[PDB]
Amino acid sequence: NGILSQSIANMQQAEATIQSFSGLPQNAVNIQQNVGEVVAALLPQVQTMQQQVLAFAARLELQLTQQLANTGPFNPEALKAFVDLVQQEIAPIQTLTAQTLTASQSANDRITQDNIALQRIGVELQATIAGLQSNLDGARQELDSLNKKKLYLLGLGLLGLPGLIALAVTLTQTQNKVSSLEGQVNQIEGQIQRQQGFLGQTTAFSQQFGSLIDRVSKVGNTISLLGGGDPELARLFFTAALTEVRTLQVDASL
Amino acid sequence: SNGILSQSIANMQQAEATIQSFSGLPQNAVNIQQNVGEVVAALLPQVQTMQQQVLAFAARLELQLTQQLANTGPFNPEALKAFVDLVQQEIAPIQTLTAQTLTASQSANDRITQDNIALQRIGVELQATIAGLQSNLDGARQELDSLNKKKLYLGLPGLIALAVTLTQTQNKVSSLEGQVNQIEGQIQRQQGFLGQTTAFSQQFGSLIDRVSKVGNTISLLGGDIANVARDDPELARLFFTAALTEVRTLQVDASLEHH
Amino acid sequence: SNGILSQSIANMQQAEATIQSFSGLPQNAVNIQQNVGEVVAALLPQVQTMQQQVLAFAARLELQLTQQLANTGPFNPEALKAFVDLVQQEIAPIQTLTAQTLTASQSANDRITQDNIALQRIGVELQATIAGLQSNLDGARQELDSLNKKKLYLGLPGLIALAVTLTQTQNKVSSLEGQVNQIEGQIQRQQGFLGQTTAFSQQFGSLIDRVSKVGNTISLLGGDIANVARDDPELARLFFTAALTEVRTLQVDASLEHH
Amino acid sequence: NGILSQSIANMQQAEATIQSFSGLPQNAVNIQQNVGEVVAALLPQVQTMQQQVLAFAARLELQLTQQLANTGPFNPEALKAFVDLVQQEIAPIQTLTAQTLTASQSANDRITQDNIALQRIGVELQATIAGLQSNLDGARQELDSLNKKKLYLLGLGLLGLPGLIALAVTLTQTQNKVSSLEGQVNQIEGQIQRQQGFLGQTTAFSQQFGSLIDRVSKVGNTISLLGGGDPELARLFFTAALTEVRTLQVDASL
């Protein structure tokens, strides 16, 4: 039903949470910029398109029902002079629609490409962790060993003082190795975390944008049909065009 | 170069701005937004303060202990007793500030967990609801079919009347389509918002764990110092050597920049 | 090369073997396992059968219609009437078998959804429970601290008795640690099992949608044929040309191998 | 508490669901093989280790309490002749433990590496979809346009017959283009789906295996300590060793 309106609203919310991230790679920054432009420029034009499409279709719908009801002389002078009006009225709305479609598809494609790039970076950060975690795990088992050595020696009174002094050097060096490795592993885990949340949002935005483009393409196709004898010619024609305006009010409904 | 405390703080600062970005959510979500707002605005400066105060205390005691150890003569058990009293007095405010910071963090993170669960419960009920509608629609498309089968079956006063039913039913199919997409929208927002809240808590749990390890270290250190007061007064060498390890443990664990 | 029906069937066959691999789960999970077992064992061969029967019927009507269209003379409205009666008779069993297959699929997939929700509800309650224990442990480690602070405070008949408390409390810390890890284990199993069930349903939803589109096409086709019976008997050319498009729509939609 | 037992059980379940997958890339097959070997060979040895560690520690725990209780002449002849027993008893258990540790770490590392490779393939399948989906989307909008053209023409009676025949060629070609593109996109989506579920399982197995290795390293360290005068020497020593056997019964508890 109100799929345009719902898609728009959901796109606005996703955009707001997309702008809220900082310190991300360039591929993310590209999406933040493009998404900015989509919401400030394309979504207003979709709203505009919607109104104009509904206004146009309601007015032609009346006029087609009027023409089905008329009587008097079949007047080929009237049909071509009517049709020409409809092709003229329709022309700029067909343009607005196609333009919207092309620019929307163009923008979505770039988000798709930047998302794939962003996932590539994601898996490569995962690979950097594997190497360092390995080191860390080892440093941590050594540290556990030293911390237990320490409590042992403390139990031995003064006999454990020589052990304890020698031990204290090593503990210091292993605590600093652990500190530095855990520090680096945590920084990278942070990046992955921020990025995965960021891609959640841009995937949600892209899916919504995809529903909007599908509706826009559908509206565009119906318009192409409208935009493109004997008495019971016109009946069948006007009857056929009426069907198309009616699906237009459904397809572009508020 | 930023250490664990400092990365957690900074990660919690970024995640909060993202949590504030979500609108139109249930009360349980708003509870997390304000809670997170107060953590960042008030609790994290406290942690910064505690961290500076722990490092300052560690640097002083480090120095004092090494000068105790550079002593070659025997140890006067009265100066010993007095130094131990001084240290226990300097330990005390720092022990208790760290305990306050740990409690305030646990309580606020415990409320994020609770509100998080309450939100998951809501989310499940949103899926129970989509299922129902989905069936009302599975089933309104059956009504739409047979109402076309029974027309593709077939005077003119049965289709003046059938038309008015048919439209009313497409208006039900569409309406239901709308409703499912609405609810899906809300589910997607909630799942996004819950991913961020979970992330904030993972960061906050790293911070809690670091603050707790610091508390523990102070306690071990307290234990080393006390084992001088009680007490062959050359036992002092051993408990000072051990205390000095705890003091340096502090410096590593609480440092503003890792190694 | 495998088409949509055939990929869905094969994906549903692999996912079922993986769903059967999980043990020690709640009743709601066992309900999905048996349901999925019966889908694969019984409903998917039905779909295979329907698919073969639709293609066979499509190939025959394709031929019959093209030979109607290769006719250059006018059309005898009695042969027309009889051919339409023949086709409506051959349409009928194929329409209804497709409707049966669609219903049996909806009902069984609807029960996977319901059991899925019931399982998510359980999972939420498992998180409410970890939270509680986590607090009982947050809080038993406080008891463990002060019971060490009050010992690092301190004759011998207070520590013969304190020892017996302390151990009893470590036995509570450990026990709780055990309990949290237990429950986490179960959560992880459920989340794994729910990922597979969701995957099975996504596949099953692709199949439902394809079967439904086929049903719809038959219906459009029925509509084209009927519009000959009713009825300038050269209108036959138009409705035969249209029927022939639906017939080929079938062949593409139901084909064992895509294009 | 029972972290060994719980880790083992959870590893057995993950392994069973890991073997249940088929038609996966080589990187998955490697994990299926290694995980097979871990559960049939390493996990039994961990169970064995556990028993022997608990049996050893209970017996030394008794003997240390007995020695703390004894009276009579300080007998250096007895301590070194006691200790030597303990170092001899302990020796093979220290070996079993270290061996277990080394082989476990070795196996986990390979799962980690195969997981990273598997994610790489995952993102590259995602990239293949983007290109084809683009084509598909376009074919589908064309098809929608043709399906609406068809209903239009059918409404025009025989005037729409010429249109309808020409249209039917194009519909056929566009349905076959859609069929083929949707077919290929669905196959790849299937692969990603199976793989993501497969990586869920191997990530769960790897995390459990990581908890087991940490416990095993802890048990190993405590053993190293045990494995490595005046009267109130022995008191302090035996008192120190008792502390270590006690944490061994805790660390390796059933």
Side-chain angles (χ1 to χ4, degrees), chain A, chain B residues 2-259, chain C residues 2-259, chain D:
Chain A
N1 202 23
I3 286 175
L4 280 185
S5 206
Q6 281 191 56
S7 295
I8 283 175
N10 293 304
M11 275 166 86
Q12 289 160 356
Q13 163 71 277
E15 189 259 2
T17 74
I18 285 169
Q19 300 304 351
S20 81
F21 291 81
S22 59
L24 288 176
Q26 185 56 47
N27 277 127
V29 167
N30 300 335
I31 291 164
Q32 282 182 322
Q33 268 154 26
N34 162 22
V35 123
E37 294 165 344
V38 162
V39 170
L42 271 162
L43 292 195
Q45 183 156 118
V46 165
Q47 284 165 330
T48 289
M49 169 206 275
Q50 189 180 32
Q51 298 158 358
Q52 291 182 3
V53 168
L54 288 169
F56 163 76
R59 180 189 172 289
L60 179 57
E61 187 186 15
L62 182 58
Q63 276 158 206
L64 291 177
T65 58
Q66 291 174 334
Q67 289 269 349
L68 289 172
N70 285 331
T71 57
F74 170 98
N75 181 30
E77 277 64 84
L79 310 208
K80 296 235 138 164
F82 167 77
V83 161
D84 280 355
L85 302 170
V86 165
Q87 305 217 335
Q88 260 156 31
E89 290 173 58
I90 219 182
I93 290 144
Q94 195 170 11
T95 295
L96 183 48
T97 297
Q99 289 173 332
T100 293
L101 190 48
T102 310
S104 293
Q105 276 188 338
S106 179
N108 208 18
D109 285 14
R110 283 148 60 221
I111 300 155
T112 304
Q113 288 308 141
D114 283 285
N115 283 345
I116 291 166
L118 252 171
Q119 302 189 56
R120 284 173 201 302
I121 298 170
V123 312
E124 219 57 46
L125 291 173
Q126 270 165 46
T128 308
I129 288 187
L132 293 168
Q133 193 63 73
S134 193
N135 291 358
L136 174 50
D137 271 358
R140 250 166 186 170
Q141 301 161 6
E142 284 176 346
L143 183 64
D144 154 76
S145 162
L146 292 171
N147 269 325
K148 279 193 283 218
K149 220 150 185 290
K150 191 219 266 190
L151 301 173
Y152 189 94
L153 286 159
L154 248 177
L156 298 200
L158 277 169
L159 304 181
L161 177 56
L164 179 58
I165 291 168
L167 193 270
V169 181
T170 309
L171 182 63
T172 269
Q173 289 149 25
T174 307
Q175 274 170 337
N176 289 350
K177 168 179 179 222
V178 165
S179 162
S180 166
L181 290 173
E182 142 187 290
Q184 282 168 240
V185 160
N186 203 76
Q187 187 76 70
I188 291 182
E189 283 184 351
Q191 273 146 44
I192 288 168
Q193 205 176 235
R194 270 170 182 216
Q195 283 182 37
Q196 283 178 347
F198 182 83
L199 274 160
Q201 290 312 293
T202 69
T203 295
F205 183 98
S206 183
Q207 171 246 309
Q208 294 293 314
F209 201 8
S211 283
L212 181 130
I213 293 174
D214 290 346
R215 190 52 64 102
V216 164
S217 183
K218 272 181 200 184
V219 157
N221 283 336
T222 296
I223 282 140
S224 288
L225 269 179
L226 288 163
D230 79 307
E232 280 193 11
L233 176 154
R235 206 151 315 151
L236 286 168
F237 165 52
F238 296 134
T239 316
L242 191 56
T243 313
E244 296 298 347
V245 284
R246 264 150 184 177
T247 89
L248 216 43
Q249 282 163 303
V250 179
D251 278 354
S253 166
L254 264 157
Chain B
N2 252 7
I4 293 291
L5 279 180
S6 296
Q7 289 176 40
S8 299
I9 289 159
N11 294 323
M12 287 169 80
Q13 280 159 356
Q14 149 78 300
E16 176 262 11
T18 293
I19 285 163
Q20 298 302 339
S21 70
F22 287 83
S23 57
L25 286 167
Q27 173 73 42
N28 300 81
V30 178
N31 297 344
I32 296 164
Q33 283 173 337
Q34 299 311 288
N35 178 2
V36 144
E38 287 162 350
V39 170
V40 163
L43 172 45
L44 293 190
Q46 249 169 90
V47 170
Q48 283 165 338
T49 291
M50 169 231 272
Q51 177 180 15
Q52 291 146 4
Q53 278 189 58
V54 172
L55 283 170
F57 155 89
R60 177 176 166 66
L61 182 57
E62 180 171 37
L63 176 79
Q64 284 173 311
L65 284 175
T66 56
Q67 295 184 336
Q68 286 297 331
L69 290 168
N71 187 327
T72 39
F75 292 97
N76 256 298
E78 256 178 355
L80 219 54
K81 180 61 170 156
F83 171 79
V84 161
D85 289 328
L86 184 71
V87 169
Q88 272 167 2
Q89 283 172 58
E90 275 155 23
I91 279 173
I94 298 298
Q95 209 155 5
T96 68
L97 190 76
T98 301
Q100 289 163 349
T101 309
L102 175 55
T103 305
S105 307
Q106 284 176 329
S107 51
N109 190 47
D110 289 348
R111 299 163 17 229
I112 300 175
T113 309
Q114 289 305 144
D115 281 297
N116 226 283
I117 292 147
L119 260 172
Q120 295 180 57
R121 286 176 195 289
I122 290 183
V124 188
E125 215 60 40
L126 282 173
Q127 264 147 5
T129 310
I130 67 176
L133 294 170
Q134 197 56 58
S135 279
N136 291 20
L137 170 57
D138 273 5
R141 285 207 263 256
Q142 278 145 46
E143 299 162 46
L144 191 70
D145 154 84
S146 85
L147 192 58
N148 271 312
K149 254 192 203 182
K150 289 181 175 202
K151 185 174 168 205
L152 283 159
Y153 198 67
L154 328 168
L156 283 135
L159 307 189
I160 268 159
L162 188 79
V164 172
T165 48
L166 195 94
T167 69
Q168 203 79 27
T169 289
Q170 291 154 331
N171 281 21
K172 192 184 287 194
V173 171
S174 309
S175 183
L176 283 169
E177 256 152 26
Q179 278 149 268
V180 300
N181 194 253
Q182 174 56 239
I183 296 330
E184 261 148 8
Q186 295 161 20
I187 284 172
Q188 176 182 260
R189 263 181 281 122
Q190 273 157 224
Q191 271 165 5
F193 177 92
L194 277 188
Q196 289 308 112
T197 63
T198 300
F200 184 98
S201 301
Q202 180 284 311
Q203 293 293 336
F204 204 4
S206 301
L207 186 142
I208 306 329
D209 298 342
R210 186 41 61 92
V211 170
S212 154
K213 172 181 199 331
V214 158
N216 285 329
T217 306
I218 294 169
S219 152
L220 286 178
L221 166 54
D224 292 334
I225 293 312
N227 277 347
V228 174
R230 287 156 165 195
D231 311 13
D232 186 10
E234 193 65 5
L235 265 186
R237 179 69 45 118
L238 182 77
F239 291 117
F240 287 159
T241 311
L244 175 61
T245 64
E246 299 290 2
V247 154
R248 300 191 169 145
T249 300
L250 285 177
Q251 313 193 280
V252 176
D253 280 333
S255 172
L256 296 134
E257 310 254 336
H258 73 70
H259 185 260
Chain C
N2 252 7
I4 293 291
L5 279 180
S6 296
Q7 289 176 40
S8 299
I9 289 159
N11 294 323
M12 287 169 80
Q13 280 159 356
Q14 149 78 300
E16 176 262 11
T18 293
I19 285 163
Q20 298 302 339
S21 70
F22 287 83
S23 57
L25 286 167
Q27 173 73 42
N28 300 81
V30 178
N31 297 344
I32 296 164
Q33 283 173 337
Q34 299 311 288
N35 178 2
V36 144
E38 287 162 350
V39 170
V40 163
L43 172 45
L44 293 190
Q46 249 169 90
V47 170
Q48 283 165 338
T49 291
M50 169 231 272
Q51 177 180 15
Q52 291 146 4
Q53 278 189 58
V54 172
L55 283 170
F57 155 89
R60 177 176 166 66
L61 182 57
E62 180 171 37
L63 176 79
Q64 284 173 311
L65 284 175
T66 56
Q67 295 184 336
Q68 286 297 331
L69 290 168
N71 187 327
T72 39
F75 292 97
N76 256 298
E78 256 178 355
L80 219 54
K81 180 61 170 156
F83 171 79
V84 161
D85 289 328
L86 184 71
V87 169
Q88 272 167 2
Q89 283 172 58
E90 275 155 23
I91 279 173
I94 298 298
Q95 209 155 5
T96 68
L97 190 76
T98 301
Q100 289 163 349
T101 309
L102 175 55
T103 305
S105 307
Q106 284 176 329
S107 51
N109 190 47
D110 289 348
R111 299 163 17 229
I112 300 175
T113 309
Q114 289 305 144
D115 281 297
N116 226 283
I117 292 147
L119 260 172
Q120 295 180 57
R121 286 176 195 289
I122 290 183
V124 188
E125 215 60 40
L126 282 173
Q127 264 147 5
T129 310
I130 67 176
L133 294 170
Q134 197 56 58
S135 279
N136 291 20
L137 170 57
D138 273 5
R141 285 207 263 256
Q142 278 145 46
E143 299 162 46
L144 191 70
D145 154 84
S146 85
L147 192 58
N148 271 312
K149 254 192 203 182
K150 289 181 175 202
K151 185 174 168 205
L152 283 159
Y153 198 67
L154 328 168
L156 283 135
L159 307 189
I160 268 159
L162 188 79
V164 172
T165 48
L166 195 94
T167 69
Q168 203 79 27
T169 289
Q170 291 154 331
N171 281 21
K172 192 184 287 194
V173 171
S174 309
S175 183
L176 283 169
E177 256 152 26
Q179 278 149 268
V180 300
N181 194 253
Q182 174 56 239
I183 296 330
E184 261 148 8
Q186 295 161 20
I187 284 172
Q188 176 182 260
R189 263 181 281 122
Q190 273 157 224
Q191 271 165 5
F193 177 92
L194 277 188
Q196 289 308 112
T197 63
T198 300
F200 184 98
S201 301
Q202 180 284 311
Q203 293 293 336
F204 204 4
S206 301
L207 186 142
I208 306 329
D209 298 342
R210 186 41 61 92
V211 170
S212 154
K213 172 181 199 331
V214 158
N216 285 329
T217 306
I218 294 169
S219 152
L220 286 178
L221 166 54
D224 292 334
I225 293 312
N227 277 347
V228 174
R230 287 156 165 195
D231 311 13
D232 186 10
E234 193 65 5
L235 265 186
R237 179 69 45 118
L238 182 77
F239 291 117
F240 287 159
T241 311
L244 175 61
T245 64
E246 299 290 2
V247 154
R248 300 191 169 145
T249 300
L250 285 177
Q251 313 193 280
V252 176
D253 280 333
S255 172
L256 296 134
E257 310 254 336
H258 73 70
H259 185 260
Chain D
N1 202 23
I3 286 175
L4 280 185
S5 206
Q6 281 191 56
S7 295
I8 283 175
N10 293 304
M11 275 166 86
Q12 289 160 356
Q13 163 71 277
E15 189 259 2
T17 74
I18 285 169
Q19 300 304 351
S20 81
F21 291 81
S22 59
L24 288 176
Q26 185 56 47
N27 277 127
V29 167
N30 300 335
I31 291 164
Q32 282 182 322
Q33 268 154 26
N34 162 22
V35 123
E37 294 165 344
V38 162
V39 170
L42 271 162
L43 292 195
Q45 183 156 118
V46 165
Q47 284 165 330
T48 289
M49 169 206 275
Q50 189 180 32
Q51 298 158 358
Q52 291 182 3
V53 168
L54 288 169
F56 163 76
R59 180 189 172 289
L60 179 57
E61 187 186 15
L62 182 58
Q63 276 158 206
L64 291 177
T65 58
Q66 291 174 334
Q67 289 269 349
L68 289 172
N70 285 331
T71 57
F74 170 98
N75 181 30
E77 277 64 84
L79 310 208
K80 296 235 138 164
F82 167 77
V83 161
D84 280 355
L85 302 170
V86 165
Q87 305 217 335
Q88 260 156 31
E89 290 173 58
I90 219 182
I93 290 144
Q94 195 170 11
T95 295
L96 183 48
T97 297
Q99 289 173 332
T100 293
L101 190 48
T102 310
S104 293
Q105 276 188 338
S106 179
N108 208 18
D109 285 14
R110 283 148 60 221
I111 300 155
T112 304
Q113 288 308 141
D114 283 285
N115 283 345
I116 291 166
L118 252 171
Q119 302 189 56
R120 284 173 201 302
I121 298 170
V123 312
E124 219 57 46
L125 291 173
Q126 270 165 46
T128 308
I129 288 187
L132 293 168
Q133 193 63 73
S134 193
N135 291 358
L136 174 50
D137 271 358
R140 250 166 186 170
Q141 301 161 6
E142 284 176 346
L143 183 64
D144 154 76
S145 162
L146 292 171
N147 269 325
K148 279 193 283 218
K149 220 150 185 290
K150 191 219 266 190
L151 301 173
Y152 189 94
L153 286 159
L154 248 177
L156 298 200
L158 277 169
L159 304 181
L161 177 56
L164 179 58
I165 291 168
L167 193 270
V169 181
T170 309
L171 182 63
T172 269
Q173 289 149 25
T174 307
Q175 274 170 337
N176 289 350
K177 168 179 179 222
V178 165
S179 162
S180 166
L181 290 173
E182 142 187 290
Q184 282 168 240
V185 160
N186 203 76
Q187 187 76 70
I188 291 182
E189 283 184 351
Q191 273 146 44
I192 288 168
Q193 205 176 235
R194 270 170 182 216
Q195 283 182 37
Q196 283 178 347
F198 182 83
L199 274 160
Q201 290 312 293
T202 69
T203 295
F205 183 98
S206 183
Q207 171 246 309
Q208 294 293 314
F209 201 8
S211 283
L212 181 130
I213 293 174
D214 290 346
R215 190 52 64 102
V216 164
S217 183
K218 272 181 200 184
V219 157
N221 283 336
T222 296
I223 282 140
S224 288
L225 269 179
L226 288 163
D230 79 307
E232 280 193 11
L233 176 154
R235 206 151 315 151
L236 286 168
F237 165 52
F238 296 134
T239 316
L242 191 56
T243 313
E244 296 298 347
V245 284
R246 264 150 184 177
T247 89
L248 216 43
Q249 282 163 303
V250 179
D251 278 354
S253 166
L254 264 157

